[PDB]
Write a protein that binds this ligand. Structure first.
Ligand SMILES: Nc1ncnc2c1ncn2[C@@H]1O[C@H](COP(=O)(O)OP(=O)(O)O)[C@@H](O)[C@H]1O
Ligand SMILES: Nc1ncnc2c1ncn2[C@@H]1O[C@H](COP(=O)(O)OP(=O)(O)O)[C@@H](O)[C@H]1O
Lengths: 152, 152
C-alpha cells in the first residue's frame, strides 16, 4: 500500500540525514565558472536534463554559483557569452546545509522559500590546523521526496 | 510537524482524484504542432521553465505529443526545424488518465515506468449522439507530491 510506504518514509525523516540521500559530488553534473556559453556548451547543459547545474572554480568542491537551464533562454550562442556574465546577472542564491541535518528539518527548509537545492558540507576538524567546510554533494527536495515515497 | 502533514496527505490519496490536483488546460503552457523551432520559439520554451510542454493540433484540447526541453539540446535554431521533425524523432509516449482516477492509483502508476505526466480526460456523455473523451488538463507526479507534503 502506498499509504504505509509514505508513512514509514515520513517516520524516517526524523533520523535520516541529508548525507544519506544527497547526490555526492562525484555523481554531480557541474560546470566550470570559466565556461563559455557557445552552442556546444549550452547543448551539453540541455542534454544533461538537470534543471540546475552547480558552477565551480578551480576544484569541483569549490561551488561558487548555480546555473539554471532557464538562464540560457535569452543567450544567443553566437555571442560566446562567458558563463560569468550570466551568473553575475541572475545571481541565484546558493544555499548550504550541514551533512548531519535531518531530513525533516531539510524538508521544512525547502518548503519555506523558493530554493529546492542545497550544497551539503561537513566541518573538517582533522587538520592540519584550521577547521574548514568540506563540500560533499548536493541535496534537493526530490531527494527527500524520493525517501518519503519509495517502496521499502 | 512534517510527519503528521505527510500522513494526513497520505490518507487523502484514497479519496482525492487527479481532477482535484491537475493543472487545468487553461493554465497549461503548450505549443502548436505547427511551430518552428527557430530561436525565439526555443527561447520562449526555455523561459517557461517547464520540463515538458504538451503539443496540440488545431484546438488546445487536441493534445497529440509531448515536447521535452531536453529535446532541443541538439537543435540548431538557424535550421528553423519544424517541431514535427522533433516530435517524430523522439516520439515521447503520451499517457492519458481519467479524471476520476484516485491519487493513490495515480501515484502507483507514476512509480512504475518512466512517465511522470498524464493528460487528464473525462468521458463526455452529454451528446449530441456519440460519447467522446474531453481533455481537461495535465497531472504530474509533482501535483501528487504536493498534495502529500503541503501544510494543512
Ligand atoms: N546538476 C546535477 N547533477 C547531478 N545530479 C543532480 C543535479 N541536479 C539535481 N540532481 C539530482 O537529481 C535527482 C532529481 O532531482 P531534481 O531536484 O528533480 O532535479 P532535476 O529537475 O534537475 O531532475 C536528485 O537525486 C538530485 O540530487
Ligand atoms: N507545460 C506545463 N504547463 C503548465 N503547467 C505545467 C506544465 N508542466 C508541468 N506543469 C505543472 O507544474 C507543476 C510542477 O510540475 P513538475 O512535474 O515539477 O513540472 P516542471 O519540472 O516542468 O516544473 C505541476 O502543478 C504540473 O502540473
Amino acid at each position: 500500500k502506498e499509504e504505509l510506504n509514505i508513512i514509514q518514509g515520513a517516520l524516517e525523516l526524523r533520523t535520516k540525514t541529508v548525507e544519506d540521500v544527497m547526490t555526492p559530488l562525484r555523481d554531480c553534473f557541474m560546470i566550470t565558472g570559466e565556461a563559455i556559453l557557445d552552442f556546444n556548451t549550452m547543448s551539453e547543459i540541455m542534454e544533461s536534463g538537470y534543471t540546475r547545474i552547480p558552477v565551480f572554480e578551480g576544484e569541483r568542491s569549490n561551488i561558487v554559483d548555480l546555473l539554471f537551464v532557464k538562464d540560457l533562454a535569452f543567450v544567443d550562442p553566437d555571442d560566446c557569452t562567458p558563463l560569468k556574465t550570466i551568473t553575475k546577472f541572475y545571481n541565484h542564491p546558493l544555499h548550504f546545509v550541514f551533512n548531519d541535518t535531518k531530513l525533516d528539518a531539510m524538508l521544512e527548509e525547502f518548503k519555506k522559500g523558493k530554493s529546492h537545492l542545497a550544497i551539503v558540507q561537513r566541518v573538517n576538524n582533522e587538520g592540519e590546523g584550521d577547521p574548514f567546510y568540506e563540500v560533499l554533494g548536493i541535496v534537493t527536495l526530490e531527494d527527500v521526496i524520493e525517501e518519503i515515497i519509495k517502496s521499502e
